[PDB]
Amino acid sequence: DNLLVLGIGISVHKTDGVLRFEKYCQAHNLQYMIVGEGKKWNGAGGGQKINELLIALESIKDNKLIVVCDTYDLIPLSGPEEILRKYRFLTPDNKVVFSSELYCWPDASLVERYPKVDTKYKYLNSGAFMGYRDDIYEMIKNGVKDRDDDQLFFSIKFIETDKIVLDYKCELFQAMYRCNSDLVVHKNRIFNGYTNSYPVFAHGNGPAKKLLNHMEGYFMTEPIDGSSNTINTFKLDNEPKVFFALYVDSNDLSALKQFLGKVASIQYGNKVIYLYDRSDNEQNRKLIQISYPNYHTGVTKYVFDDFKKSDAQFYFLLEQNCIITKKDILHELIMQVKDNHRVISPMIGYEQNSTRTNFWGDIEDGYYKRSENYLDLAKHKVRGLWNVPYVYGVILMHESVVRNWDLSMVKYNDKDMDLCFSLRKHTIFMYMINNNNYGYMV
Ligand SMILES: [Mn+2]
Predict the structure, then answer these.
(1) Cα(21) to centroid of ligand 1, in Å?
(2) I want to staple 9 with a disulfide (CB 3.0 to 4.6 A). Which of 71, 192, 228, 372 is the partner?
(3) 82 occurs within a structural domain
(4) For 383, phi and psi rounded to 5 degrees?
(5) Are residues 344 and 432 in the same domain?
(6) Measured in angstroms, how far is the CA atom of residue 205 from the centroid of ligand 1?
(7) Residue 36 and residue 17: Cα distance in Å, rounded?
């Protein structure tokens, strides 16, 4: 009746993936520990995961039933009772149950060595497994190289011993990659229509991180508060310090004045404001600097150095073409910042065309792709927080993101695309929020 979940999360600072994993664990009353928390990542690869798990197993002396799983791209959707029932049904012999998956990876030549089975879910995936501590210890007691492939290691174990059984019917585990057409969200669960099951652990393995991120906006960790927007004015009892970073171009003095007027109307007591001007019109700067002394010229990238030197707890990035009309927006946004929700961007559309917005629901080779629910979100058919690959122009970011992670990585040579690229690379999530009417773009 006892169960412990060992989620692998090796990092000096916590990603949003691990934060989300933890929140889902707590919501389902799953006892867990994060293996490798606070330690540096080294690890095809992932050998360090086995090495860190071995260390963790040294503190578990009793022969406990344990789950071992990825955390960055994985969430539990049910509690210990369901997991225990399924485990006992899957393996009366108390073997180690591993996730199945569609592909034979990383060694495609193991194909002929796997047991033949009717299902397309033929192969092992090492991102989730469950068994007795002693059995798992026995398999890993000698360690591996940090750079070894944990998936290959366990695949060999599976084909060459009798210690492991695969979860072919996706009862405990779902490797979601390329299973889009099998899976639907129903009653706060994933239902797999292929296997006729409701997998407990939803693993967005490999690229399927985007499928899991997409579904996340439909799940809940507890019943929603239906009165959350009944009063849609917001005011914090205590205002944390917010650093306003304004990305402007004084070449267009008209746009600048209109934008600064809206920014000045955002209601917020505890702030510091910096202007980062693309241009260098000196007479303009002189004028504006009377009201905004923190003024820098020739800036064509996003700047975090001033923020880092400040004692601000939030960074609020605002682009000149983004017109905020909801005066209490910062109170509203800050109230949503908690757990894995650390980067939040209010949805606004073009004044001329309101379905074209400051977020992308999907991405393909780096650029905008229309997602399944994009138009629903843009027209407010459903509202809330949505995990998306790109946000633009109005972004609130908690200091734990800005102070601890490299947000200046370059792939596209485009400041807004590169910010989102950096976040994606670190498993820091961007949340679009569409709870109210916030503004528009010009
Ligand atoms: Mn994974």
Answers:
(1) 12
(2) 71
(3) yes
(4) -135, 150
(5) yes
(6) 4
(7) 14
- Which range of residues forms the domain containing residue 404? 242-441
Structural determination approach: X-ray
Q: How far is CA 206 from the centre of its chain?
A: 14
Q: Are residues 207 and 353 in the same domain?
A: no
d(CA 323, CA 266): 11
Place of tokens 């809206």: 262
Rounded distance from Cα 363 to ligand 1 centre (Å): 20
Q: Domain ends where: 216, 234, 262? A: 216
Q: Distance, CA 69 to ligand 1 centroid (Å)?
A: 8
Q: 70 C-alpha to center of ligand 1: Å?
A: 5
Q: Is residue 148 part of a domain?
A: yes
The full DSSP string for 160-187 is HSSSEEEETT-SSEEE-TT-GGGEEEET
Cα of 22 vs centre of ligand 1, distance in Å, is 15
Q: How many domains does the chain have?
A: 2
End of a domain among 201, 216, 231?
Answer: 216
In a domain, 223, yes or no: no
